[PDB]
Design a protein around this ligand. Sequence first.
Ligand SMILES: [Zn+2]
Lengths: 75, 81, 82, 135, 44, 65, 70, 212, 78, 69, 75
Amino acid sequence: TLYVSQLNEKINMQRLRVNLFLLFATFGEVLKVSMNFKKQRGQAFITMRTIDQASLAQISLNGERFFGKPLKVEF
Amino acid sequence: NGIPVKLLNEAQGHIVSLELTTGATYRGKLVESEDSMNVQLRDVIATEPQGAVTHMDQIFVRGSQIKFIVVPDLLKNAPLF
Amino acid sequence: MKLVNFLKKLRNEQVTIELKNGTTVWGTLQSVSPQMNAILTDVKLTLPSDNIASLQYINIRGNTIRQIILPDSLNLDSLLVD
Amino acid sequence: MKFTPSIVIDAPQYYVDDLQLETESMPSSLKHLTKPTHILDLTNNDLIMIPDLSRRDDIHTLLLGRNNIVEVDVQNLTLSNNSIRRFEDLQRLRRALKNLTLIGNQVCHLANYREHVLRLVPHLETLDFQNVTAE
Amino acid sequence: IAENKIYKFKKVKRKRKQIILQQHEINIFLRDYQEKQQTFNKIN
Amino acid sequence: VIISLRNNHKIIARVKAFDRHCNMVLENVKELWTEKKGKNVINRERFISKLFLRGDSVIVVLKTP
Amino acid sequence: PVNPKPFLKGLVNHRVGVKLKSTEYRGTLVSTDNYFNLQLNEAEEFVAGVSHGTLGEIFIRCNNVLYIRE
Amino acid sequence: RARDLDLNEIFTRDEQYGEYMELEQFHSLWLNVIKRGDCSLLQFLDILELFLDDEKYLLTPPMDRKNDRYMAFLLKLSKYVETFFFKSYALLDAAAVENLIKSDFEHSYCRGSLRSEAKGIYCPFCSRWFKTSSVFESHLVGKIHKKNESKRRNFVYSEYKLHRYLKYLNDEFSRTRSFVERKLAFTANERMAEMDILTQKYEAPAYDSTEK
Amino acid sequence: VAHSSRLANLIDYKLRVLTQDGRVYIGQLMAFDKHMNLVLNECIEERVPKIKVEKRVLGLTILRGEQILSTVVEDKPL
Amino acid sequence: VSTPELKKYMDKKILLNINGSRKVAGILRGYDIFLNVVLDDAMEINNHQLGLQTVIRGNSIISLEALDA
Amino acid sequence: MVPPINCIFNFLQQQTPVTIWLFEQIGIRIKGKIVGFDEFMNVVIDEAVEIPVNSKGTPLGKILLKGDNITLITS
RNA sequence: AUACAUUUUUUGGCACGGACGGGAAGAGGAGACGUCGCGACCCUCGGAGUCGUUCUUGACUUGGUCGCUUGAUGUUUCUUCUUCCCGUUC
Ligand SMILES: [Zn+2]
C-alpha cells in the first residue's frame, strides 16, 4: 500500500479515485483511499493486493505527471 | 415479530431517509418507530415529486404511505444481525 | 373449503400468471405460499404487444397476481377433496 | 492458455474499489460470464488485438494494460503499455467512451498525436489522464 | 435390433437422453464432415 | 355466469370453486375487454382452458338464465 | 338509535341503489352479511344515471361499494 | 467439438427428449378458434387423428378451411410438428426429406392424387370436385383457380406437410395419446409422482457416474 | 442461481426488486418478513423516465412489502 | 396494538396532509389506536373554513406536519 | 383527550349538519346528519346532500355511506 | 461409504437506391421551479480517533460562489419542414 502525494487537489473525489484505479491497474489490482479534508488534500493511499505489485507501481511511476502535476510516491 | 420492524427501531438517533407513495423523500433524525412504521422525524428536508424542496421541523408519517426507508450503513454491523 | 389448499397441491405446473397491471407471466409453480406469493422457476415475461424477457427465478406477490392460468390437463374434483 | 468456460468461472469475481471480473492469446467466450461485470481486467497477458467480444451491455471498463494490442476491431478504456503504432489504428475508436488511456504506446510519439485523437474522437473527456480543453 | 448387437457382442442399453445427445453430436460431426469435403473439392 | 372486473373484463366462465375471498376456479373462460388506441373501436376476446381468479378484482358476479 | 346493521337487515327485499368506486346500480336486495357483501335481484345498471342494461340477478362484492340509496 | 451443445435448449420437459410431443399448448390455442369450450384434450387429439388419413383432414375438416383463425392456427400447427420431426431424428438429411415432400407435393398432390370413383377428382385449393380428367385439366388455367393458388399456396403446402410429418410420427402420436389417458386417470399422489420423474429425466446428466 | 424452494433459504443473495410505481431495486437481501418487508444491503434505486435507466444509490434500505411487486435474483453472494 | 405516540403533538396546530393532494390544518384534540384524528377545525388548503371541529379517518392521512414546534 | 369512537357517539345525539368528503374523490362531497354508529367508521346518514366541489346543489335521498370512503367527519 | 378477507401490509382507488438516430446551418424546439457537473482573472494554504478493564472485549463522540462563449437531468402549461456530413439495418 503506497502513499502518494503532490497531486492536483482540484480533481473531484469520485473522479480522482477512478483515475487512480485505472493508472495503477498495470501494476496490479487497485483499491485507492483518499479524502478531501484539509489534512488530506492532494493525498492518496492506493492499497495493492500483492506486495511486489506496489513496488513496481512506485518506482516506474515516480514523478509521473498526473492532472498536470508530477506525483510523489512513498511506502 | 417482524425483523425489518426491529432495525427501524434501531434507526433511532441516526439520519434516516423516507419517501412516500406520493414520491416525497424526507431526511431527518428518526425519533420513534412502532410495529406499523409510524415514524417521527426532526430537522427534516422534504423534496417535491417535481423537484422542489421545503424545510420543515417535526413530521409524523403513517406507515401505510411508505414506499421505502433508507437507513445509514452503520446499523449494518451491530446488533440485530 | 379453502382455495389456498387448492394452490398448495398444484405443484411443478408450467402455468401462465396474469398480473394486476396486465403482465403475462409464463412460469412453473414450485411452491405457493398461503398468502398467494407464487414461487416460479423458468420464467418468461411478456407484456399485454411488446417484447419478451426470459428469466430464471421470480417470486411474485399475491395481490399483484390477478389470475393464475391453470394447466391444460387437470382433474379439479380430486383436488377439491380434502 | 486459451479462454474457455473452465477459465472464466474460477477467475475472481469481486467488486473493485463496481463488480469486477479478474482475468491469453486472444479473447473469446465472454458469453460465459453472462454480462454480470461492469469493469474487466485483461492486464498482464499476451492479447494481440481486442477482437471478438460478444454483446455485453454491462461491461463499461476494459483494463487492457501490458499487452501487445496493436489494432482495434464502454465508458472507460485503459490501453496502457501496448503495441499501437499508427493513429489510423485508433480510427476504430470513433464508433465507441469518456475515459481513454493510450500511454506507453509507440503511436504516442507521433507528431500531432494529441490533436488527431481529440478531433476524430470527440466523445473522449479524459485522454492520457488529462482533461480535454476547448483550446 | 432387439439384442442390441452388431456382429457378436451385446452392449449395455442406454436411455433416450444419451442417445439423442449423440444423435445431435454426430450431426455437428457430419456438418463438419461435409464442410471440409466442400472446400476439399474446391481445392483439389 | 358473467363477472365484471376492475379493469373492464366481462369474465364469462363456469364456476368450479368458491370461498370466503371469492377466489374462484374458472372453466370455459371468456374475458371480454378492449385494448384500444386513442380513437380505436375493437372488441377483442379469447378462450382459456382453466383459470384461477382473485376476489378483490371481482366487482359484480351476474347469472344469466 | 338507528344503527347501520339493523337498517341493512331491514332493507332486505326492498329496492336499493349502489354506486361504485364509477357506475350506479338499481335492484331489489336479496340478503347481506356483516362484511357488507350484497346480493340483488332485478338489476338495472345506470351509467351516470343512464340505464345501460337490465342485468337481473347479480352479486356485488363488498370492497367496491360507496353508498346504498332508496 | 461439442462442449456447449445442450439438449435442454432444444428439447422441453413435456416432450421427454422426443418421447412425447407437447400438444397441450396448442389445445389452448385451439379453444380460441372454435368459439366454444366443448373441446376436451382427448377430443382435440381425436381432431388431430384426421391428419393421419389421406382423406379425413381434407374431406371432413374440423371447420371451414377458409376461416382465417383456422388457417392461422394450422400454419403454426404444421411448423412445430415439422420442426419436432427433424428435432427427434437429427441424424437424417433435412433437405433430402424436405425436397422429397415437395416433389410429392408438386407432382402428385397438385395433379390430383386424391381421386374418388363417384365424384371424380378433388382439388385442395378449390375445395370442389370434378367430373373427368379433361374437365379437371381445363380448370387449372381458369380465373377462379388462379386466385386460390395465388392466395392459399402457403397454407395448403403447410397442410400437406403436417399430414406427411405426422404420418412419419405415428408411433409418437399414439404414445402421446396414451400419456393423456394415463394422466387423466391419475390421482393427486399419482400425478405428483409422475411430474417428479418427468422432471428428473430432464435435469439429470446423460452420463451417470455409475455407468459401464 | 441455484434452484431454491423458498425465499428465506436464499438469504444474502443479490436481488432485483420491482415496485408498483415503476421503480427497480437491486440489492442484497439482509432480511425477509411476514408481510414481505425487505432489508436490502446495498440497494440502488433504478427508475426509467417516460427513455433510459436512471440510477440512484441509496444504501441500507427498509422496503415496505406493500409496494413490492416481485423479487428476482440478480447475482451470486460475496 | 401499540398506541401512536402523539402525546408530544397534543393541543398543537398541525398540517394534516390527506389524500388527493389536499391539506387539513387544526389544533389536536385526541386520537385512537387506528390513528383517526379528532381536532378543532381550521382551514383547507385561497383558504376557507368549514366546521367547528373535524374528525379525520386514519386511512386518508399522508402525513401530519406540525405548525407549532 | 376526546377519542374518535366517543366523538361519533356525541354527533348522533346532536343531530347537526355533517359534511363528509369522499376518499380519492375530490369533486363530490356529502352533507347530512349522522344517524348510525358501528364498530368501524360506517354510519347511516339520513337526508344527505351531494355537493359538487368548487374548483350548487343536487338532489339526493337518505343514505348509509360505507366507512372506507370516509375522509372527514365534522359536526 | 457408514387458520383465515370491513383503516398500517396479502384481498389494493385500479384503469383509460429506401428507413432510424446524432450533430451543425437556414426558413415559418421555447419561458420558469429546483439538482450537480466543465473553466476560473475567484475563495481557501494543509469505517475511523480515545479510555475503562484484561490477555481480549464493552461504552462515548465524528468543495462555497461566478461564468457554460451552445454542461447533463426531472415536474409543469402552451404550439414543424427542406438540404449537407457521420454510423446502424435491408
Ligand atoms: Zn384446382
